[PDB]
Curated annotation (Swiss-Prot):
Modification N6-acetyllysine, positions: K69
UniProt gene name: trxA
Protein name (record): Thioredoxin 1
Subunit (UniProt): Monomer. Interacts with bacteriophage T3 DNA polymerase.
NCBIfam families with a match to the protein in the record: PRK09381.1, thioredoxin
Residue(s) at site: Deprotonates C-terminal active site Cys: D26
CDD domains: TRX_family (cd02947)
A Gene Ontology BP annotation from the UniProt entry: cell redox homeostasis
Disulfide bonds: C32-C35
Pfam families, per database record: Thioredoxin
Record function comment: Participates in various redox reactions through the reversible oxidation of its active center dithiol to a disulfide and catalyzes dithiol-disulfide exchange reactions.
Organism: Escherichia coli (strain K12)
Length: 108
């Protein structure tokens, strides 16, 4: 993309778990309706939140390893990482407005 980290099983530790800041990970798949529905929305958020957090996308079919370690079932699942630790969790789609509220409240 441009600002979105395109994650893999092998880059997860470095990209997410080792990052000095907040990472908003999207677990998601090509066939998933709601994932695709929010994909443009993650684009918007990556812009508005520059220097506050980085957005990262793990497609859980091309990267099957990492999902089971966070007990993911329902997709999309958005996970806020704070310096490699999960602060917050949202399952399913939500609008841009609903995601602002989530981040703003959990980034504090």
């Amino acid at each position: 993309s441009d600002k979105i980290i395109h994650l893999t099983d092998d880059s997860f530790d470095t990209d997410v778990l080792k990052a000095d800041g907040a990472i908003l990970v999207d677990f998601w798949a090509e066939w998933c309706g709601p994932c695709k529905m929010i994909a443009p929305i993650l684009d918007e958020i990556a812009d508005e939140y520059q220097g506050k957090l980085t957005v990262a996308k793990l497609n859980i079919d091309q990267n099957p390893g990492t999902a089971p370690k966070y007990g993911i079932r329902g997709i999309p699942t958005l996970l806020l990482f704070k310096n490699g630790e999960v602060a917050a969790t949202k399952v399913g789609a939500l609008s841009k407005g609903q995601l602002k509220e989530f981040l703003d409240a959990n980034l504090a």
